[PDB]
Design a protein around this nucleic acid. Structure first.
Ligand code: MN
Ligand code: MN
Ligand code: ZN
Ligand code: ZN
Ligand code: ZN
Ligand code: ZN
Lengths: 162, 162
DNA sequence: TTGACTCTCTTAAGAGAGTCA
DNA sequence: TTGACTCTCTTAAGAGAGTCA
Protein backbone atom coordinates (compact mmCIF):
# COMPACT_ATOMS: atom_id res chain seq x y z
CA UNK A 1 0.00 0.00 0.00
CA UNK A 2 1.13 3.58 -0.63
CA UNK A 3 2.70 5.14 2.49
CA UNK A 4 1.64 8.50 3.98
CA UNK A 5 4.77 10.02 2.42
CA UNK A 6 3.82 8.55 -0.99
CA UNK A 7 0.25 9.95 -0.73
CA UNK A 8 1.57 13.40 0.26
CA UNK A 9 3.91 13.29 -2.77
CA UNK A 10 0.88 12.49 -5.01
CA UNK A 11 -1.05 15.44 -3.47
CA UNK A 12 2.02 17.69 -3.98
CA UNK A 13 2.50 16.71 -7.67
CA UNK A 14 -1.23 17.23 -8.28
CA UNK A 15 -1.15 20.70 -6.67
CA UNK A 16 1.96 21.64 -8.68
CA UNK A 17 0.27 20.64 -11.98
CA UNK A 18 -3.19 22.14 -11.21
CA UNK A 19 -1.52 25.33 -10.00
CA UNK A 20 -0.33 25.88 -13.57
CA UNK A 21 -3.84 25.55 -15.03
CA UNK A 22 -5.30 28.81 -16.41
CA UNK A 23 -6.68 30.90 -13.54
CA UNK A 24 -10.03 32.47 -14.42
CA UNK A 25 -11.57 35.27 -12.35
CA UNK A 26 -15.36 34.88 -11.94
CA UNK A 27 -17.72 37.37 -10.29
CA UNK A 28 -20.40 35.48 -8.36
CA UNK A 29 -23.49 36.09 -6.22
CA UNK A 30 -22.89 35.68 -2.48
CA UNK A 31 -26.50 36.09 -1.37
CA UNK A 32 -28.01 39.14 0.26
CA UNK A 33 -27.59 41.11 -2.97
CA UNK A 34 -23.79 41.06 -2.66
CA UNK A 35 -21.22 40.04 -5.26
CA UNK A 36 -17.86 38.38 -4.71
CA UNK A 37 -14.92 37.02 -6.71
CA UNK A 38 -13.71 33.44 -7.14
CA UNK A 39 -10.49 32.35 -8.87
CA UNK A 40 -10.92 28.99 -10.59
CA UNK A 41 -8.02 26.89 -11.85
CA UNK A 42 -9.60 25.35 -14.94
CA UNK A 43 -8.52 22.12 -16.65
CA UNK A 44 -8.23 22.60 -20.44
CA UNK A 45 -11.19 21.77 -22.70
CA UNK A 46 -9.16 19.25 -24.73
CA UNK A 47 -5.96 17.25 -24.56
CA UNK A 48 -3.30 17.81 -23.37
CA UNK A 49 -4.72 18.57 -19.92
CA UNK A 50 -1.55 18.45 -17.81
CA UNK A 51 0.91 15.87 -16.51
CA UNK A 52 -1.00 12.92 -15.07
CA UNK A 53 -4.46 14.02 -16.26
CA UNK A 54 -6.83 12.35 -18.71
CA UNK A 55 -10.50 12.73 -19.56
CA UNK A 56 -12.83 9.74 -18.91
CA UNK A 57 -16.06 11.66 -19.65
CA UNK A 58 -17.44 14.96 -20.99
CA UNK A 59 -17.00 16.62 -17.53
CA UNK A 60 -14.99 13.79 -15.88
CA UNK A 61 -11.22 13.43 -15.43
CA UNK A 62 -8.74 11.16 -13.64
CA UNK A 63 -5.25 11.63 -12.18
CA UNK A 64 -2.74 8.80 -12.68
CA UNK A 65 0.68 8.12 -11.13
CA UNK A 66 2.89 5.03 -11.37
CA UNK A 67 4.65 4.18 -8.11
CA UNK A 68 7.08 1.26 -7.78
CA UNK A 69 5.83 -0.16 -11.08
CA UNK A 70 2.14 -0.04 -10.03
CA UNK A 71 -0.36 2.23 -11.76
CA UNK A 72 -2.59 4.20 -9.37
CA UNK A 73 -5.56 6.26 -10.53
CA UNK A 74 -7.99 8.60 -8.76
CA UNK A 75 -10.89 10.80 -9.73
CA UNK A 76 -9.29 14.12 -10.60
CA UNK A 77 -11.03 16.10 -7.82
CA UNK A 78 -10.53 13.43 -5.11
CA UNK A 79 -6.76 13.89 -4.75
CA UNK A 80 -6.82 16.69 -2.09
CA UNK A 81 -8.73 14.33 0.19
CA UNK A 82 -6.64 11.13 -0.02
CA UNK A 83 -5.70 11.38 3.67
CA UNK A 84 -9.32 11.84 4.79
CA UNK A 85 -12.00 9.30 5.68
CA UNK A 86 -13.79 8.17 2.54
CA UNK A 87 -17.28 7.69 4.04
CA UNK A 88 -19.45 9.30 6.71
CA UNK A 89 -22.80 8.18 8.19
CA UNK A 90 -22.62 5.16 5.89
CA UNK A 91 -22.43 7.40 2.80
CA UNK A 92 -19.57 7.64 0.30
CA UNK A 93 -17.66 10.94 0.38
CA UNK A 94 -17.59 12.90 -2.88
CA UNK A 95 -15.61 15.88 -4.11
CA UNK A 96 -17.99 18.84 -3.98
CA UNK A 97 -17.42 22.06 -5.95
CA UNK A 98 -18.05 25.12 -3.79
CA UNK A 99 -17.59 27.18 -6.97
CA UNK A 100 -20.03 25.00 -9.01
CA UNK A 101 -17.44 24.94 -11.87
CA UNK A 102 -16.69 21.29 -12.84
CA UNK A 103 -13.49 22.09 -14.77
CA UNK A 104 -12.11 23.90 -11.74
CA UNK A 105 -9.57 21.90 -9.75
CA UNK A 106 -8.65 24.62 -7.21
CA UNK A 107 -8.56 22.66 -3.90
CA UNK A 108 -9.67 25.83 -2.08
CA UNK A 109 -12.94 25.42 -4.04
CA UNK A 110 -13.54 21.77 -3.06
CA UNK A 111 -14.91 19.99 -0.04
CA UNK A 112 -15.42 16.31 0.77
CA UNK A 113 -18.96 15.27 1.73
CA UNK A 114 -21.92 13.02 0.96
CA UNK A 115 -23.53 13.25 -2.47
CA UNK A 116 -26.71 14.64 -0.85
CA UNK A 117 -24.74 17.45 0.88
CA UNK A 118 -22.93 18.07 -2.42
CA UNK A 119 -26.15 18.35 -4.45
CA UNK A 120 -27.85 20.53 -1.84
CA UNK A 121 -25.34 23.33 -2.29
CA UNK A 122 -26.93 24.00 -5.74
CA UNK A 123 -29.86 25.67 -3.95
CA UNK A 124 -28.06 27.36 -1.03
CA UNK A 125 -28.80 31.09 -0.54
CA UNK A 126 -25.07 31.66 -0.06
CA UNK A 127 -22.62 32.88 2.58
CA UNK A 128 -24.28 36.32 2.75
CA UNK A 129 -27.84 35.09 2.22
CA UNK A 130 -28.36 32.56 5.01
CA UNK A 131 -26.08 29.58 4.33
CA UNK A 132 -26.18 27.12 7.24
CA UNK A 133 -23.60 24.66 5.87
CA UNK A 134 -21.04 24.02 8.61
CA UNK A 135 -18.38 24.12 5.91
CA UNK A 136 -19.65 27.39 4.49
CA UNK A 137 -20.53 27.89 0.83
CA UNK A 138 -18.32 30.22 -1.20
CA UNK A 139 -21.29 31.49 -3.23
CA UNK A 140 -25.03 31.35 -3.65
CA UNK A 141 -26.01 28.15 -5.43
CA UNK A 142 -26.75 28.53 -9.17
CA UNK A 143 -30.27 27.15 -8.76
CA UNK A 144 -31.31 29.28 -5.77
CA UNK A 145 -34.47 31.28 -6.33
CA UNK A 146 -38.24 31.19 -6.78
CA UNK A 147 -38.15 28.46 -9.42
CA UNK A 148 -40.27 28.07 -12.53
CA UNK A 149 -43.15 25.89 -11.38
CA UNK A 150 -45.70 25.34 -14.14
CA UNK A 151 -48.68 24.24 -12.03
CA UNK A 152 -49.26 24.18 -8.30
CA UNK A 153 -51.36 22.00 -6.02
CA UNK A 154 -54.96 21.78 -7.16
CA UNK A 155 -58.04 19.55 -7.23
CA UNK A 156 -61.13 19.50 -9.50
CA UNK A 157 -63.50 18.20 -6.82
CA UNK A 158 -63.72 18.21 -2.99
CA UNK A 159 -62.17 14.78 -2.18
CA UNK A 160 -59.07 16.22 -0.54
CA UNK A 161 -57.87 18.45 2.30
CA UNK A 162 -54.21 19.57 2.65
CA UNK B 1 -56.85 10.55 -24.05
CA UNK B 2 -57.09 13.07 -26.87
CA UNK B 3 -60.28 15.04 -25.91
CA UNK B 4 -60.37 17.62 -23.08
CA UNK B 5 -63.55 15.86 -21.92
CA UNK B 6 -61.65 12.53 -21.90
CA UNK B 7 -58.74 14.12 -19.97
CA UNK B 8 -61.15 15.67 -17.40
CA UNK B 9 -62.82 12.26 -17.01
CA UNK B 10 -59.39 10.65 -16.35
CA UNK B 11 -58.56 13.32 -13.73
CA UNK B 12 -61.98 12.91 -12.12
CA UNK B 13 -61.78 9.10 -11.91
CA UNK B 14 -58.21 9.37 -10.59
CA UNK B 15 -59.30 11.85 -7.94
CA UNK B 16 -62.23 9.65 -6.87
CA UNK B 17 -59.98 6.59 -6.49
CA UNK B 18 -57.14 8.42 -4.73
CA UNK B 19 -59.74 10.09 -2.50
CA UNK B 20 -60.42 6.65 -1.00
CA UNK B 21 -56.76 5.96 -0.16
CA UNK B 22 -56.09 5.95 3.60
CA UNK B 23 -55.50 9.44 4.97
CA UNK B 24 -52.36 9.48 7.11
CA UNK B 25 -51.56 12.52 9.23
CA UNK B 26 -47.91 13.63 9.24
CA UNK B 27 -46.56 16.33 11.55
CA UNK B 28 -43.76 18.18 9.80
CA UNK B 29 -41.15 20.90 10.36
CA UNK B 30 -42.08 24.22 8.77
CA UNK B 31 -38.87 26.05 9.49
CA UNK B 32 -38.53 28.81 12.12
CA UNK B 33 -39.00 26.27 14.91
CA UNK B 34 -42.63 25.74 13.89
CA UNK B 35 -44.53 22.53 13.10
CA UNK B 36 -47.52 21.82 10.88
CA UNK B 37 -49.85 19.00 9.90
CA UNK B 38 -50.23 17.42 6.46
CA UNK B 39 -52.84 14.83 5.45
CA UNK B 40 -51.36 12.44 2.88
CA UNK B 41 -53.56 10.10 0.83
CA UNK B 42 -51.28 7.07 0.68
CA UNK B 43 -51.39 4.33 -1.95
CA UNK B 44 -51.38 0.85 -0.31
CA UNK B 45 -48.09 -0.97 0.23
CA UNK B 46 -49.22 -4.03 -1.73
CA UNK B 47 -51.76 -5.06 -4.32
CA UNK B 48 -54.59 -4.26 -4.73
CA UNK B 49 -53.80 -0.53 -4.88
CA UNK B 50 -57.06 0.80 -6.33
CA UNK B 51 -58.94 0.80 -9.62
CA UNK B 52 -56.55 1.68 -12.42
CA UNK B 53 -53.33 1.56 -10.35
CA UNK B 54 -50.36 -0.79 -10.63
CA UNK B 55 -46.84 -0.77 -9.20
CA UNK B 56 -43.94 -0.60 -11.73
CA UNK B 57 -41.22 0.02 -9.12
CA UNK B 58 -40.57 -0.17 -5.37
CA UNK B 59 -41.81 3.48 -5.07
CA UNK B 60 -43.24 3.89 -8.62
CA UNK B 61 -46.84 3.44 -9.82
CA UNK B 62 -48.85 3.95 -13.00
CA UNK B 63 -52.50 4.80 -13.65
CA UNK B 64 -54.19 3.11 -16.64
CA UNK B 65 -57.55 3.62 -18.38
CA UNK B 66 -59.11 2.09 -21.52
CA UNK B 67 -60.46 4.88 -23.79
CA UNK B 68 -61.84 4.16 -27.28
CA UNK B 69 -60.73 0.50 -26.85
CA UNK B 70 -57.07 1.65 -26.36
CA UNK B 71 -55.10 1.44 -23.08
CA UNK B 72 -53.71 4.86 -21.99
CA UNK B 73 -51.15 4.85 -19.14
CA UNK B 74 -49.47 7.59 -17.08
CA UNK B 75 -47.11 7.90 -14.15
CA UNK B 76 -49.39 7.77 -11.13
CA UNK B 77 -48.58 11.29 -9.88
CA UNK B 78 -48.76 12.96 -13.33
CA UNK B 79 -52.54 12.69 -13.78
CA UNK B 80 -53.53 16.01 -12.06
CA UNK B 81 -51.41 17.88 -14.62
CA UNK B 82 -52.57 16.28 -17.90
CA UNK B 83 -53.84 19.67 -19.15
CA UNK B 84 -50.57 21.46 -18.42
CA UNK B 85 -47.53 21.95 -20.67
CA UNK B 86 -45.29 18.91 -20.34
CA UNK B 87 -42.07 20.93 -20.58
CA UNK B 88 -40.73 24.26 -19.36
CA UNK B 89 -37.70 26.10 -20.73
CA UNK B 90 -36.85 22.90 -22.61
CA UNK B 91 -36.89 20.78 -19.43
CA UNK B 92 -39.34 17.96 -18.76
CA UNK B 93 -42.06 18.75 -16.24
CA UNK B 94 -42.21 16.33 -13.31
CA UNK B 95 -44.66 15.64 -10.54
CA UNK B 96 -43.06 17.03 -7.39
CA UNK B 97 -44.03 15.98 -3.86
CA UNK B 98 -44.38 18.99 -1.56
CA UNK B 99 -44.87 16.49 1.30
CA UNK B 100 -41.75 14.45 0.40
CA UNK B 101 -43.90 11.25 0.73
CA UNK B 102 -43.74 9.12 -2.45
CA UNK B 103 -46.78 6.95 -1.61
CA UNK B 104 -48.88 10.09 -1.21
CA UNK B 105 -51.15 10.89 -4.15
CA UNK B 106 -52.92 13.93 -2.62
CA UNK B 107 -52.92 16.47 -5.49
CA UNK B 108 -52.90 19.24 -2.89
CA UNK B 109 -49.38 17.96 -2.08
CA UNK B 110 -48.14 17.92 -5.71
CA UNK B 111 -46.81 20.47 -8.15
CA UNK B 112 -45.55 20.27 -11.73
CA UNK B 113 -42.03 21.60 -12.30
CA UNK B 114 -38.57 20.85 -13.64
CA UNK B 115 -36.59 18.03 -12.05
CA UNK B 116 -34.12 20.62 -10.74
CA UNK B 117 -36.90 22.61 -8.97
CA UNK B 118 -38.28 19.30 -7.66
CA UNK B 119 -34.94 18.12 -6.25
CA UNK B 120 -34.13 21.51 -4.73
CA UNK B 121 -37.11 21.40 -2.40
CA UNK B 122 -35.25 18.69 -0.42
CA UNK B 123 -33.02 21.44 1.04
CA UNK B 124 -35.54 24.28 1.39
CA UNK B 125 -35.73 25.94 4.84
CA UNK B 126 -39.53 25.76 4.62
CA UNK B 127 -42.55 28.06 4.59
CA UNK B 128 -41.69 29.51 8.03
CA UNK B 129 -37.91 29.44 7.62
CA UNK B 130 -37.39 31.44 4.43
CA UNK B 131 -38.78 29.45 1.49
CA UNK B 132 -38.65 31.58 -1.68
CA UNK B 133 -40.33 29.06 -4.00
CA UNK B 134 -43.04 30.92 -5.91
CA UNK B 135 -45.19 27.82 -5.49
CA UNK B 136 -44.55 27.65 -1.77
CA UNK B 137 -43.25 24.62 0.07
CA UNK B 138 -45.54 22.83 2.52
CA UNK B 139 -42.64 21.87 4.83
CA UNK B 140 -38.94 22.29 5.45
CA UNK B 141 -37.02 19.95 3.16
CA UNK B 142 -35.85 16.73 4.84
CA UNK B 143 -32.19 17.41 3.97
CA UNK B 144 -32.07 21.02 5.20
CA UNK B 145 -29.33 21.60 7.74
CA UNK B 146 -25.60 22.05 8.34
CA UNK B 147 -24.56 18.84 6.57
CA UNK B 148 -21.84 16.40 7.60
CA UNK B 149 -18.83 17.54 5.58
CA UNK B 150 -15.73 15.44 6.32
CA UNK B 151 -13.07 17.82 5.00
CA UNK B 152 -13.18 21.41 3.83
CA UNK B 153 -11.10 23.35 1.30
CA UNK B 154 -7.37 23.06 1.89
CA UNK B 155 -3.98 23.13 0.19
CA UNK B 156 -0.55 21.86 1.20
CA UNK B 157 1.51 24.44 -0.73
CA UNK B 158 1.07 28.10 -1.66
CA UNK B 159 -0.13 27.82 -5.27
CA UNK B 160 -3.84 28.64 -4.80
CA UNK B 161 -6.06 31.55 -3.76
CA UNK B 162 -9.80 31.53 -3.20
C1' DT C 1 5.56 5.23 -17.22
C1' DT C 2 2.69 8.06 -19.77
C1' DG C 3 -1.17 10.04 -22.79
C1' DA C 4 -5.52 9.82 -24.99
C1' DC C 5 -8.91 7.68 -25.69
C1' DT C 6 -12.65 3.72 -24.60
C1' DC C 7 -16.44 1.58 -21.54
C1' DT C 8 -19.79 1.23 -17.66
C1' DC C 9 -21.39 2.59 -12.76
C1' DT C 10 -23.86 5.46 -8.30
C1' DT C 11 -27.54 8.19 -6.22
C1' DA C 12 -32.22 9.80 -5.42
C1' DA C 13 -35.52 12.85 -7.24
C1' DG C 14 -38.18 11.42 -11.27
C1' DA C 15 -40.06 8.32 -16.07
C1' DG C 16 -41.80 4.77 -20.30
C1' DA C 17 -43.18 0.17 -21.89
C1' DG C 18 -43.89 -5.34 -22.12
C1' DT C 19 -45.62 -9.97 -20.20
C1' DC C 20 -49.02 -12.75 -18.60
C1' DA C 21 -53.72 -14.09 -16.53
C1' DT D 1 -61.05 -4.76 -19.63
C1' DT D 2 -58.64 -4.86 -15.46
C1' DG D 3 -54.96 -6.47 -12.42
C1' DA D 4 -50.24 -7.76 -11.07
C1' DC D 5 -46.26 -8.25 -12.16
C1' DT D 6 -41.55 -7.65 -15.24
C1' DC D 7 -37.82 -4.69 -17.49
C1' DT D 8 -35.05 -0.45 -18.62
C1' DC D 9 -34.66 4.81 -18.96
C1' DT D 10 -33.62 10.33 -17.40
C1' DT D 11 -31.10 13.86 -14.97
C1' DA D 12 -27.09 16.15 -12.95
C1' DA D 13 -24.30 16.06 -8.98
C1' DG D 14 -20.73 12.43 -8.67
C1' DA D 15 -17.40 7.47 -9.69
C1' DG D 16 -13.96 2.92 -11.31
C1' DA D 17 -11.52 0.39 -14.80
C1' DG D 18 -9.56 -1.34 -19.91
C1' DT D 19 -6.79 -0.83 -24.33
C1' DC D 20 -2.92 0.43 -27.00
C1' DA D 21 1.50 2.18 -28.14
MN1 MN E 1 -21.65 19.89 -6.53
MN1 MN F 1 -39.39 15.72 -4.90
ZN1 ZN G 1 -13.44 27.02 -8.78
ZN1 ZN H 1 -24.45 26.82 1.93
ZN1 ZN I 1 -48.68 14.04 0.99
ZN1 ZN J 1 -39.39 26.15 -0.61
Amino acid sequence: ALTNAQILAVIDSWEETVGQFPVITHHVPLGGGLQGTLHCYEIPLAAPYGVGFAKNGPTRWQYKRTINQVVHRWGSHTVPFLLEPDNINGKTCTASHLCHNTRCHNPLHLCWESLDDNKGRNWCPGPNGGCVHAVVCLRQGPLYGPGATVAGPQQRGSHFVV
